[PDB]
Ligand binder design. Structure first.
Ligand code: SQD
Ligand code: DGA
Ligand code: ZN
Ligand code: ZN
Lengths: 401, 103, 87, 61, 119, 44, 93, 117, 212
């Protein structure tokens, strides 16, 4: 835009020519910015590629950073790590329930239908009704049949819809789901974040402090403390997921993993290194530069085949040892495992439930959808208790008259 | 006592909804070979109302296929939303969010 | 049933859609937009709404933790190779 | 007995919709930005029983 | 250490030769990489842009802080450069300063090398 | 089963040297070619 | 949005509304990114085929309101089989 | 514009053009069959579903279209085949009840080996 | 597609890391993973490029067998809409339901946790995976000459809640990191805007040049 006019561009055979044509000036500016983009690309490629030459790995663990505790491979071992948060198998569906509840809020898979339902209940003034359907009528009561019960339950839907709408309004107003139009995937992630971080929309209600900032009293002192102590665990789990995914991305290629986590319930830390499994060294790691990193399958085959097949060159003829190696050999040498075989001992906690699933075949129909779980406080036993207690309750209600 | 338990009143099986409201093609039935014998083990060994629904479906789509309708197009949703579908979706979202308490 | 493969086929693996994919489907179907009687094939139900009945309660959209089933299941693993060879 | 849902609805529906509605959550709570009864129940201090009982232990003191 | 241990262990004054060879190879590799990088035209554009930015920002900082400094003593455009070649805007005393500092830093390499190797 | 094996190129650090040079030098050519295409093959 | 590619973008993150402050700020930003990912909207783009197969009806309608036979009918059943696959349990596609 | 749309079209065009050039390379060296073109004629005819044969006869006897009436005729054939396949997916085929659907999607039955030979 | 669908997951390999069955700190321990492995609860093991990290896939207990539990989605139903179950009461060890026999469910119908695990640096030369593979693959059909017939023994069938393990190793060379970095969305949008302005200025320059 005629920026080469002011005073101080005289003396350049090409700039004075650019003075006479604005298009040359504008394409000069475009090229000037594109060359800088190219330079930035060159440099950042170099800077993310060169560090891979200087990375060396501890040779005893092979970059794992962690070795095995054989005492556990066959009240327990006390050398090898602290059990992780998910080793408790009897806590699985509970944690999954909490997490899927928290995930139900953020979800926008059914965004459009929820939106137009909110737009239908919102005004209720449009009413561009088309032509109503030829309406069926259900087979009347006193006809006990599964098809008939299906039909009667199908015809009892609008009044129940209004009833639940009374009990639980549109989720867009109870803010149980993410807001009306906070995000749609066709704007800019730049805009979509700003809308997300406006007012604590990055959390569900149950952890939001705006819901609780009004009441905190002498009674418990937990209403504003035991929700901050839950927000904290929430953010910790989110950060752990981010870290584990960075490690998975570094292991999808053959790179060394960036996050060195502590050992676990079957492994001890490598003694040679600190548990740090690798590092940068200023010496170029010739094996990566010359592409000799991985060990040629046949070599590993030979190694493992000669490690799993030890040899006994001495014979018990001269040497007075007729027993194999080990301890307590004299005591070492003192039902239906050959047919069905072993009984699996990891799943007794479901035995009871299965028995119930055999005592009540009707629970196997597609109309019932139990939440799930194992214990008496979860899943099938909840429905059984509800059914039995309600039938007894209202049968005793029949006893009043 | 009203808590997370679920019940048979929510029709959580799409084949029932389809064979009761949308699918009226009747089949030529024959002998089977796999069936649930005693002990409830799958081993190897109403029609007139749905006919009425069949006929009314044929009439309705015959009417809206020759361009006789308030709107205009063999195929378009007419915003007379079957509340049966809107209902299920609400029940599902509600139980999924209400799973909060089962601890 | 003795000479069946136990490795099903590259084909008979039906599709299963993740959450993002059911969202894509729900969008692309929500904004998707003489003869006489007894000429019909008796499948004259409304095409649009049964599609949403499918998308929200269909089998190919019913496992909430399906990541990419067709790809990772239409490849053969090491054990499936060892089993093919043995036949 | 005679708790909430059969007071508001009650004769609003048959006994079938009673169970039908009863199986979808206690009332409406933290998942819905509300303040649950059990969590609010701690936000109330003790009653006058506290008052004159502690006054009596004060007199004994 | 594992590096130096390996080249000491596997291959009459031979280990010192191997170690000198390793250190020279590594330094030369890094220097060759850097020179080959800045031998690309667009990377020269990149470094020129960063230099003019840092010059202007240092000028701002200098003005501000020197002015507040002699105040405490009282107590007690861009395009003209960005579109012109590099050497016509920079003086020569600057590069002479760079060269003098370099020379003064490394002028004791021969004596140190000789003393190190010879007992 | 008919098993087939490659030629396995015994040298290993003479079989790999030139291909590694290419692995290191070609990205620069790809970046330069892409940017050259956009910034000269259009606004000549 | 104009600093999406470089690292300088990082300094922008600290400018919107037992351990120190920068820690909890970073963790809030991380939670923001995870939450934005969790909304299941990432895959929808204007140029998919899953979006082009159900939008050919409307575009055909408005455009008409604006060995060949085998080719046509087989193209029809090909697009229909594609919709069968992307819809529910189809068996070979 | 929108490279995300250009790249798939680019590769599709590449491979389809290569297929065309290969077909040309095969029709000149090995000239086309004179009568087995009827073999392929009928064997691409046989897999046309029944819901399309209604226009095939309408394609034989004159009253096909001008060019536009068929292009709205076979549309409803496509659509009824579509809904029929949907019903075969969900409620099964014409000679197949829910037990047999559970049999088929559980992969319970083996392919008949005795009947094979 | 047969070509494109492949090539696309080479360039876009970071989008295909599992994001569905992994939620928070979803690690298990090496002993917990070993225990789950020995008793046949792991459906799919996915060993990664460096061979020092794995993603265990474990079905939800009710989605493992074909029991008609009312927590599995009603995939398979009778005419009278009752889900099917495939129990067999173990004539050798009755009175204990957990030792009964039942068919396993198709892998594309399981709900699955996807746990993370770091393997030790001596996992391959200890032979745990080899022991498991050999134990599970060394049993099959038989011919019984006493009763003259083919026979699938009981020790070759799956009890309740047990599945068959599928080990799958990934290829490090199937990653293509350079192109995934080169064609990133931000670089894509920059390329597009630059090309737009380029074609604009070319046609505008020729417009003003024919206008002379
Ligand atoms: C016959 C006679 C000889 C002919 C030789 C012809 C060329 C031979 C070499 C070609 C392959 C080079 C190489 O392997 O790739 C190594 C580099 C990756 O860089 C590299 O990437 C590596 C990581 S990874 O591969 O991305 O995962 C990394 O190790 C390395 O540091 C980095 O440099 O790959 C490329 O630069 C070439 C990609 C191919 C370009 C496709 C056409 C361009 C289309 C634009 C879109
Ligand atoms: C023959 C030697 C080929 C080298 C193969 C060994 C692998 C090189 C990896 C080095 C990593 C450099 C880097 O971090 O990568 C970064 C680096 C960018 O700075 O990459 C580059 O650009 C690389 C620069 C190009 C190197 C080519 C020069 C080799 C040949 C020298 C001239 C031929 C000599 C004259 C003939 C002699 C006749 C007697
Ligand atoms: Zn141990
Ligand atoms: Zn180590």
């Amino acid at each position: 835009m005629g920026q080469f006019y002011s005073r101080e561009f005289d003396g350049d055979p090409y700039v004075d020519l650019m003075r006479s044509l604005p298009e040359r000036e504008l394409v000069w500016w475009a090229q000037k910015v594109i060359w800088l983009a190219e330079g930035f690309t060159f440099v950042d490629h170099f800077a993310r590629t060169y560090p891979r030459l200087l990375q060396h790995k501890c040779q005893r663990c092979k970059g794992a950073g962690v070795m095995t505790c054989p005492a556990c491979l066959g009240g327990g071992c006390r050398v090898c790590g602290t059990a992780c948060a998910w080793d408790a198998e009897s806590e699985w569906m509970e944690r999954w329930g909490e997490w899927e509840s928290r995930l139900a809020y953020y979800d926008k898979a059914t965004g459009p239908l929820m939106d137009e339902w909110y737009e239908d209940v919102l005004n209720a003034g449009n009413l561009e009704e088309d032509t109503p359907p030829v309406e069926d009528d259900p087979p009347g009561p006193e006809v006990t049949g599964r098809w008939a019960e299906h039909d009667r339950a199908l015809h009892k839907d609008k009044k129940r819809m209004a009833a639940l709408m009374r009990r639980w309004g549109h989720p867009y107003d109870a803010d149980a789901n993410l807001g009306y139009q906070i995000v749609d995937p066709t704007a800019s992630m730049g805009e979509n974040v700003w809308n997300m971080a406006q007012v604590y929309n990055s959390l569900p209600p149950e952890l939001n402090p705006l819901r609780t900032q009004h009441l905190a009293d002498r009674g418990g002192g937990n209403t504003q403390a035991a929700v901050e102590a839950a927000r904290s665990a929430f953010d910790a789990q989110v950060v752990m997921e981010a870290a584990l995914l960075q490690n998975l991305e570094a292991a999808a290629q053959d790179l060394p993993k960036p996050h060195r986590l502590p050992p676990t319930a079957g492994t001890v830390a490598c003694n040679e290194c600190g548990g740090a499994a690798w590092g940068y060294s200023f010496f170029p790691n010739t094996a990566v530069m010359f592409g000799l990193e991985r060990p040629f399958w046949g070599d590993t085959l030979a190694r493992l085949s000669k490690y799993w097949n030890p040899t006994q060159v001495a014979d018990p003829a001269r040497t007075g040892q007729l027993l194999p190696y080990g301890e307590g050999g004299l005591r070492r040498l003192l039902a239906l495992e050959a047919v069905v075989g072993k009984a699996p001992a990891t799943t007794g906690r479901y035995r009871r439930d299965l028995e119930l699933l055999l005592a009540h075949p009707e629970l196997r129909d597609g109309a019932l959808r139990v939440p799930g779980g194992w214990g008496p406080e979860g899943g099938l036993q909840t429905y059984l208790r509800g059914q039995q207690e309600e039938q007894a309750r209202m049968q005793r209600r029949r006893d009043l008259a | 006592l009203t808590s997370l338990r679920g019940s048979k009143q929510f029709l959580n099986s799409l084949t029932i909804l389809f064979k009761h409201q949308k699918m009226f093609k009747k089949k030529t039935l024959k002998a089977h070979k796999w069936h649930s014998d005693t002990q409830g083990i799958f081993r190897k060994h109403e029609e007139s109302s749905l006919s009425t629904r069949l006929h009314i479906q044929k009439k309705r789509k015959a009417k809206k296929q020759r361009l006789e309708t308030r709107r205009q197009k063999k195929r378009t949703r007419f915003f007379p939303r079957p509340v049966w579908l809107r209902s299920r979706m609400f029940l599902n979202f509600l139980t999924e969010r209400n799973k909060y308490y089962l601890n | 049933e003795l000479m069946r493969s136990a490795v099903p086929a590259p084909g008979e693996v039906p599709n299963r859609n993740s959450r993002g994919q059911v969202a894509e489907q729900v969008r692309a179907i929500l904004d998707q937009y003489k003869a006489k009687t007894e000429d019909m094939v008796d499948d004259a139900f409304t095409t649009e709404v049964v599609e949403e009945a499918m998308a929200l309660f269909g089998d190919a959209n019913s496992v909430k933790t399906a990541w990419r089933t067709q790809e990772v299941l239409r490849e053969l693993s090491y054990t499936q190779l060892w089993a093919l060879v043995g036949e | 007995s005679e708790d909430s849902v059969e007071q508001e609805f009650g004769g609003d529906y048959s006994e079938a919709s009673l169970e039908y509605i009863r199986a979808l959550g206690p009332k409406k709570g933290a998942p819905f930005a509300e303040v649950d009864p059990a969590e609010q129940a701690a936000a109330l201090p003790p009653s006058q029983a506290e008052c004159e009982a502690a006054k009596a232990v004060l007199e004994n003191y | 250490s594992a590096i130096i241990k390996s080249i000491n262990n596997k291959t009459s004054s031979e280990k010192e030769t191997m170690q000198l060879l390793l250190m020279s190879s590594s330094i030369l590799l890094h220097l060759c990489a850097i020179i080959s990088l800045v031998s690309i035209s667009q990377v020269r554009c990149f470094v020129k842009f960063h230099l003019i930015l840092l010059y202007k920002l240092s000028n701002v900082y200098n003005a501000i802080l020197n002015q507040l400094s002699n105040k405490l003593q009282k107590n007690l455009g861009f395009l003209v450069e960005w579109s012109s070649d590099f050497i016509t805007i920079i003086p020569e005393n600057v590069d002479i300063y760079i060269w003098n500092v370099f020379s003064k830093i490394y002028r004791t390499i021969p004596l140190s090398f000789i003393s190190t190797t010879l007992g | 089963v008919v098993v087939d094996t490659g030629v396995t190129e015994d040298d290993r650090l003479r079989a790999s040297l030139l291909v590694q040079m290419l692995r290191y030098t070609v990205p620069f050519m790809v970046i330069s070619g892409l940017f050259w295409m956009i910034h000269t093959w259009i606004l000549d | 949005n104009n600093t999406q590619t470089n690292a300088f973008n990082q300094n922008l993150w600290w400018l919107l509304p037992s351990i120190p402050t920068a820690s909890k700020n970073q963790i809030a930003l991380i939670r923001l990114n995870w939450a934005l990912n969790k909304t299941n909207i990432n895959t929808f783009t204007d140029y998919s085929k899953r979006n082009n197969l159900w939008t050919t009806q409307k575009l055909r309608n408005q455009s008409k309101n604006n060995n060949i036979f085998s080719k046509k009918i087989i193209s029809k059943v090909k697009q229909k089989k594609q919709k069968l696959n992307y819809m529910t349990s189809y068996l070979n596609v | 514009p929108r490279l995300a749309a250009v790249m798939p079209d680019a590769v599709y065009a590449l491979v389809q053009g290569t297929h065309k050039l290969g077909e040309y390379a095969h029709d000149l060296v090995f000239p086309p069959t004179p009568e087995d073109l009827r073999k392929l004629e009928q064997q691409v005819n046989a897999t046309i579903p029944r819901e399309f044969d209604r226009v095939r006869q309408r394609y034989a006897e004159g009253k096909i279209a001008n060019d536009e009436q068929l292009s709205s005729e076979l549309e409803d054939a496509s659509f009824n085949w579509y809904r029929r396949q949907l019903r075969t997916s969900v409620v099964g085929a014409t000679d197949e009840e829910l037990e047999d659907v559970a049999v088929r999607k559980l992969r319970l039955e083996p392919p008949a080996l005795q009947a094979s030979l | 597609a047969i070509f494109w669908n492949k090539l696309l997951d080479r360039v876009q390999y970071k989008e295909n890391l599992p994001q569905a069955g992994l939620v928070g700190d979803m690690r298990i321990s090496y002993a917990k993973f070993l225990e789950l492995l020995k008793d046949q609860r792991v459906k799919r093991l996915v060993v990664y490029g460096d061979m020092r990290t794995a993603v265990v896939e474990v079905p939800h207990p009710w989605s493992a067998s074909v029991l008609g539990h009312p927590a599995t989605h009603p995939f398979y139903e009778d005419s009278a809409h009752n889900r099917v179950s495939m129990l067999r009461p173990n004539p050798a060890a009755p009175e204990d339901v957990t030792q009964w026999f039942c068919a396993e469910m198709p892998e594309w119908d399981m709900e699955k946790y996807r746990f993370y695990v770091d393997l030790p640096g001596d996992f391959w030369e200890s032979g745990v995976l080899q022991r498991h593979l050999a134990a599970q693959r060394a049993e099959g059909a038989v011919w019984d000459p006493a009763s003259g017939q083919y026979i699938l023994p009981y020790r070759a069938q799956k009890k309740v809640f047990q599945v068959s393990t599928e080990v799958q190793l990934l290829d490090p060379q199937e990653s293509w990191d350079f192109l995934g970095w080169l064609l990133a969305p931000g670089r894509l949008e920059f390329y597009e805007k630059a090309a737009c302005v380029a074609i604009a200025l070319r046609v505008l320059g020729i417009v003003i040049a024919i206008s002379t």
